[PDB]
Design a protein around this nucleic acid. Sequence first.
RNA 1: GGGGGCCUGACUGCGAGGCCUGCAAGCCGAGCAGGGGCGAAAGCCGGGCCUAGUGAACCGGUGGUCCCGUGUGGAAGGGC
RNA 2: CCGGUGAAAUUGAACUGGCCGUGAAGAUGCGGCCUACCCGUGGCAGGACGAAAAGACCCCGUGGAGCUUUACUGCAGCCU
RNA 3: GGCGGUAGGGGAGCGUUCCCGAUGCCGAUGAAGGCCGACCCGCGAGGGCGGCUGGAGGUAAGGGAAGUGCGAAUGCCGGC
RNA 4: UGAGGGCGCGAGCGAUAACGUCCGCGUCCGAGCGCGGGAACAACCGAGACCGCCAGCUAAGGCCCCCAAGUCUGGGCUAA
RNA 5: AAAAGCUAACCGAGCCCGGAGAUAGCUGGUUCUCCCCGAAAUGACUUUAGGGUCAGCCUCAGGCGCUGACUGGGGCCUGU
RNA 6: CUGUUGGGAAGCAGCGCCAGAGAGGGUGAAAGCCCCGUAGGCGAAAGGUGGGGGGAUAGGUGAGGGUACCCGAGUACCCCGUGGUUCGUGGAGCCAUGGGGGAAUCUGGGCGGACCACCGCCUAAGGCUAAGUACUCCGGGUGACCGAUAGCGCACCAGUACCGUGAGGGAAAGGUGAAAAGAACCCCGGGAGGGGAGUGAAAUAGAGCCUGAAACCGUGGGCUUACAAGCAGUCACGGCCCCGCAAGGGGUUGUGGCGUGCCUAUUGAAGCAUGAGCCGGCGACUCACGGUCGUGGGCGAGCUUAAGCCGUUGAGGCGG
RNA 7: GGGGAACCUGGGGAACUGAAACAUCUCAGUACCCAGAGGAGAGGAAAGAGAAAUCGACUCCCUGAGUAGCGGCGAGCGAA
RNA 8: AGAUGGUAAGGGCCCACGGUGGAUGCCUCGGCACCCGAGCCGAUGAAGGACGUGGCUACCUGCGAUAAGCCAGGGGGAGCC
Lengths: 146, 117, 99, 63
Amino acid sequence: DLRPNPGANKRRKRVGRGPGSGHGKTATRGHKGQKSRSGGLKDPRRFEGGRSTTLMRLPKRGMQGQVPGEIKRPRYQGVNLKDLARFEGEVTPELLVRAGLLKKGYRLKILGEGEAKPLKVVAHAFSKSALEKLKAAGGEPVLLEA
Amino acid sequence: PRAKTGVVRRRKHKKILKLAKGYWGLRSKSFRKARETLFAAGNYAYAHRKRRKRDFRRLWIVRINAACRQHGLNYSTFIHGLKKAGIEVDRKNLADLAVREPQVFAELVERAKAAQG
Amino acid sequence: GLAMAVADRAREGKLLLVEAFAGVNGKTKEFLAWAKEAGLDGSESVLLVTGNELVRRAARNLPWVVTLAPEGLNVYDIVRTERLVMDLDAWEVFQNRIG
Amino acid sequence: PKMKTHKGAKKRVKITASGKVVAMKTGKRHLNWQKSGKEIRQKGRKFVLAKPEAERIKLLLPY
RNA sequence: GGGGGCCUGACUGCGAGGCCUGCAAGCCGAGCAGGGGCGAAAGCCGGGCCUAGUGAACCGGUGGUCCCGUGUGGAAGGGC
RNA sequence: CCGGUGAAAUUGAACUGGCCGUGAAGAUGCGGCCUACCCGUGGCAGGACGAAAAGACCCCGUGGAGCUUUACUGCAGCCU
RNA sequence: GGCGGUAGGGGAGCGUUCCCGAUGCCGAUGAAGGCCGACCCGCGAGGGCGGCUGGAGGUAAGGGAAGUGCGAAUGCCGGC
RNA sequence: UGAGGGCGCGAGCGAUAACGUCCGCGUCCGAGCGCGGGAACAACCGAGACCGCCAGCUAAGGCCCCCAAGUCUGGGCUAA
RNA sequence: AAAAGCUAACCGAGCCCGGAGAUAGCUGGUUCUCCCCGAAAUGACUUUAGGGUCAGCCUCAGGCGCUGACUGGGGCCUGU
RNA sequence: CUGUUGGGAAGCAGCGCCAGAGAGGGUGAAAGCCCCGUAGGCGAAAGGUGGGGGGAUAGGUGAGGGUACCCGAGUACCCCGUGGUUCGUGGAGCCAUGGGGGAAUCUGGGCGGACCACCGCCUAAGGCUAAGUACUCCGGGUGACCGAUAGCGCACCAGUACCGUGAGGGAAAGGUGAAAAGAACCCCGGGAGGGGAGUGAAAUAGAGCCUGAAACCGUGGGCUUACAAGCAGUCACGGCCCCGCAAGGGGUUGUGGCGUGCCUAUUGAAGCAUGAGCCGGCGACUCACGGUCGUGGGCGAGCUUAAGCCGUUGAGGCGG
RNA sequence: GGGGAACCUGGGGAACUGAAACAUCUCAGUACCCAGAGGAGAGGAAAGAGAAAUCGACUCCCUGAGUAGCGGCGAGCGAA
RNA sequence: AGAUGGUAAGGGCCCACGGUGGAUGCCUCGGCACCCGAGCCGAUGAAGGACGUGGCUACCUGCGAUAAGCCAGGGGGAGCC
Ligand SMILES: [Mg+2]
Ligand SMILES: [Mg+2]
Ligand SMILES: [Mg+2]
Ligand SMILES: [Mg+2]
Ligand SMILES: [Mg+2]
Ligand SMILES: [Mg+2]
Ligand SMILES: [Mg+2]
Ligand SMILES: [Mg+2]
Ligand SMILES: [Mg+2]
Ligand SMILES: [Mg+2]
Ligand SMILES: [Mg+2]
Ligand SMILES: [Mg+2]
Ligand SMILES: [Mg+2]
Ligand SMILES: [Mg+2]
Ligand SMILES: [Mg+2]
Ligand SMILES: [Mg+2]
Ligand SMILES: [Mg+2]
Ligand SMILES: [Mg+2]
Ligand SMILES: [Mg+2]
């Protein structure tokens, strides 16, 4: 293809809205008409009316914070073995991040659904009702400790 | 990339002048006056192009009425016979044969006094 | 996008890898005869790639031939020019990109 | 720039896993001088809503 | 509706399906388990013949709770 | 009246009659009817709801500002 | 079969300024702009054509970026 | 968008006044101040206007003149 | 020497520069063309009544396909 | 280089040349090769710089055992007010402290979010320290930045004229021609201003001298108007003058038909509700970041970078 | 010793505004006043961080991160 | 009896020709921003300014009682005040 004639496809050009005209868009600039319109209508999300919002809900969802804030206990993240059959061997968190899971959430636990290739998976924990689902396969050593 | 007005705003005011030709005083040289009286025209011309028939629709009848009453009968009594004769011809204009040879129309009259009396 | 355009000249044949040069040194005259003995008669435009800063000189003043280092194969200039030329010194990085 | 979440809504609401929004039920720490023991049950359980949840969704969004 | 007896179902854990209705609410409710009251049993009991007699949310007191509790162990505060 | 010099507010545009009705209902401007050669000049002020400073009047604004107080909170100062 | 239409919604287009298209092309045998016209294309906003003036820049087809299209705001500048 | 308005009707207020108001049904103006009758007359009557034509059928309403259409036929009525 | 008078021609708080493009639920303006559809002035809440959130009524795109308005027949509810 | 239009050639045609230089600007119009210059290369007696190299100097260079010496004072620490850290007294630490109480020398002293025990980090109350970082009066390069109402207020004798005592406010205004070659001279006339001749390619480029619109003023010509009631127009016919070929077309209007200016707010207009004397220009939904929906393209259990690092200078690649 | 367009450190330090009123809060230690340091300024060699019997002076960009947290827990504020 | 032109003081409509006025189009010793560089000056008197200075000089510019300027070195080579 030469330099010109490489136009776009279709359904993609901008032609944005130009509401300063005389029969295209209206002489009130689109979504305006009544009044109280030049700056803003406050935030139509959490507010407006001036009644009581809908913040009238109760926030029991506790442990809403202290002072030093969060605390460093490790995030246990699980992983469904459905695609653990994509590979095989002494699979370790070391590469499970390289595959496309965990992502330094760290502390890998295995669980899930499906046939498991008797592939000996080393991790930090295993779901019981899946561990016998592994017991009919191979071997599963545990993490270091805590 | 600035894009001043320039050509655009003038040429338009020249077109309104172009249609405001012969309009009294400021109504043809002052722009936003010429804009106005053009609004009424296109409206005045609209309605009247709907009206020009009713004008002639009326005129024809009087001439017709002028003719029938020169035989001795009214327009109301004239038309019925023609209609009784079932003659979807008479375009109320084409009944202008009162100075376009009359016997052609004078003997349309007697073909009316038939089917009614 | 780098690949697509290269085959576009291959798909039309408008391609050439080179390696031999009567103009391995600096002279615009020491090139246009090379083009004569290769097939570029000033009819249509050309992009050129080489890792030698001498040949560039030998054509940096060529209106229908724009310089290009082996790296920034800008798809602009590729599609810009109506024909393409490149070298192995390119066809190892273009390969190390994809190949 | 960089929209600020609404911690006054985080502490109150939890975003589901089908996009729905669910809050604890209202009316359980004031009116309880003995009224319907029935009521102290369908108010200790979470409930979902309708239109206004999208008014809430947009108050979160990075979370 | 007027009397007498025995009782505490003015229970707990749920709760299908629905009236009204913009939201929040408000309102009725069969069915099951734990345990109990009455009645010989069928059965009834999740307040009063009903429709009014009430207050989102924020903040804080009191009693329990396998909870969280900052390097760790108690503690302080928080959470249900 | 003649010679010389020569502004202003106002102004959408005008070829600007009266009367009796209509009409958000005070019509040169709509309907009907009557009157009226074109154009000035001197003057009078009934109309053009006349020019408004955004009426000197009343009301509104979760406006302003001055003043008052055993309205609220703070401060100087004063006692302690 | 439908096509009156305000707020409002969707779709489609015309014009201006600039960039790729360009070391390209049109331009002294006259460009942009300004006076015309009863010619032609388009329903359109617009694009071409003949004449006059002017005297040096202007840029197609397809893409891109906008300080982008005026009839009013007792809008502002200037002129009358 | 959340000020509506008119008319017919069923109520309340009002004086079985208000071209006054608050409701319900429906209609129309607003958005149909675009056409025809109502002299004039936004919502009373007819009738939804995409454009053109010097073509025909009609509704309301009208047929002596402005004003298009019977001084139409028969039968009564009234002398203001 | 007291009117709230005067403080550089308008003093219930001087003038200038700045915060500064303060704020304004208020007024007014909001610019080119053509096609299709096409409303609302209702209800609830609101220091709420010119404003604002939700439902209602509108437009567009996708997934549904006789259900939809209206009528006829059968049943039921109604207490002017 | 020549030839040919052209007042003028860089244009057009032919024949060539350079190229590490074909980026630009100027020359009577559009030049790679007429001019300055660009590619590339050389360069200062003097001042400065120094950030790269080198010399010198400042400074610095061992361990084991014992000793019972010293390790930064109203300081540490505690309380009463307080500020900073996201900490609005909150469970409220830590850092600094205005007031008050007031230590110790490694058998010591602070900290790890009240407090205590252990465990771990630190050794305060003396000071100094380049680099990496912000800015643009200045210089350079660059621009999908403007082009005389724009761009800062000033392209120009502008922070001027002008206003105000004063701080302070603060404009308007560019364009002959390539060359002044700028009108000798004659005539009207007091001059100004004009006629002619002349220069000039052009004076219809005349010194507010490129283009010259619109409002506004006037002269000439075609149509009309002194029995007529008017948002000033529309429709029809005739009439007058003009263009044109049949036929048709332009401009005007006498008569007849109808005809309640525009915008805005209003339920509501023709309106006695807002606004505009007119004209011409400036003037009003863009941008940044995050996010919901839609769509176009890339990959697809994956998808993707940010700061930054190498390189021509309108090239990209790494960077997980 | 004074000047220097902005940049930098310290001493003081608002209110409009937001909260659709408004006092805690925000705007913000911003704008403004003062003193001073130069081509940069400030900071700068742990009585540090923070959980590993680990990092190692200080500044600067990215991410962490609108996380943890702060809040008439309301607007909204905002680390390491 | 009747019918009918017929004059324009002036106006309106239009075409032509100009006057003011300056938009639009073209040009730019001007500014706007980005990146780099560079970054202080003064008691040896600074930044800024007053007055003067020329053969004649009104303003600008430069300069300073030696005054549109002095001295030495370096660049350059036909004009200059
Ligand atoms: Mg636009
Ligand atoms: Mg519309
Ligand atoms: Mg407003
Ligand atoms: Mg609300
Ligand atoms: Mg499992
Ligand atoms: Mg007819
Ligand atoms: Mg006849
Ligand atoms: Mg009058
Ligand atoms: Mg008061
Ligand atoms: Mg242009
Ligand atoms: Mg009528
Ligand atoms: Mg139809
Ligand atoms: Mg008749
Ligand atoms: Mg006073
Ligand atoms: Mg010739
Ligand atoms: Mg200017
Ligand atoms: Mg000005
Ligand atoms: Mg204008
Ligand atoms: Mg300097």
